Amino acid sequence: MNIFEMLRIDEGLRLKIYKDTEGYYTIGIGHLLTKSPDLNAAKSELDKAIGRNCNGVITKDEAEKLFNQDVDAAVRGILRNAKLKPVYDSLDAVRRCAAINQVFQMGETGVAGFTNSLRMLQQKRWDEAAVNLAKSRWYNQTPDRAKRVITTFRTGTWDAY
């Protein structure tokens, strides 16, 4: 297991524009295109992201290219966030994957607001952090995925995947 295999499980792979769990136009491996309800706006974002007129459809290679960019941007965003970087750097490699997964799904601003969970993670109070993390809209809206990510934070193992 690694961050790519982990997010591939959590996000799936779809080559045509679809709506994510929040109803937002998405493609590939969890590549959010737009929060606009206008499919044309989503198609415009897709074409801009890929560099050609896609008409709502991409190849697996293109999906994997956006995924590589999105993972890289997620972890670099963590390192550039003054609240997230010290917590991330305190973690072992497996728990760092859980952190990237959260930011990939929720955005770095949503994650950085998890002030009490982040402190428990930095303190290595793993069971307490896991309890706090589940007290969230994140968990209630995507409980099976959140349970996997939380188990990863709690144990530092890949048991949930």
CA distance 93 to 10: 18
Give the start-to-end residue ranges of the domains of the chain.
Answer: 3-155
- Which residue in 119, 149, 155 sits closest to 134, CA to CA? 149
Structure-determination technique: X-ray
11 as an active site residue: the answer is: yes
CA distance 4 to 103: 14
DSSP one-letter code for 147: H
Q: State residue 149 phi and psi, 5-degree precision.
A: -65, -40
From 20, 45, 62, 108, active-site residue: 20
Please indicate if the annotation marks 44 as binding a ligand.
Answer: no
Fold category of 3-155 in CATH: Lysozyme (1.10.530)
What ranges in the chain are assigned the alpha helix state H? 3-11, 39-50, 60-79, 84-90, 93-106, 108-112, 115-122, 126-134, 137-141, 143-155
DSSP one-letter code for 140: H
Please indicate if the annotation marks 32 as binding a ligand.
Answer: yes
Degrees to nearest 5, angle at CA 106 with 66 and 62: 10
Q: How many Cα neighbours within 13 Å face the side chain of 81?
A: 23
Please indicate if the annotation marks 81 as binding a ligand.
Answer: no
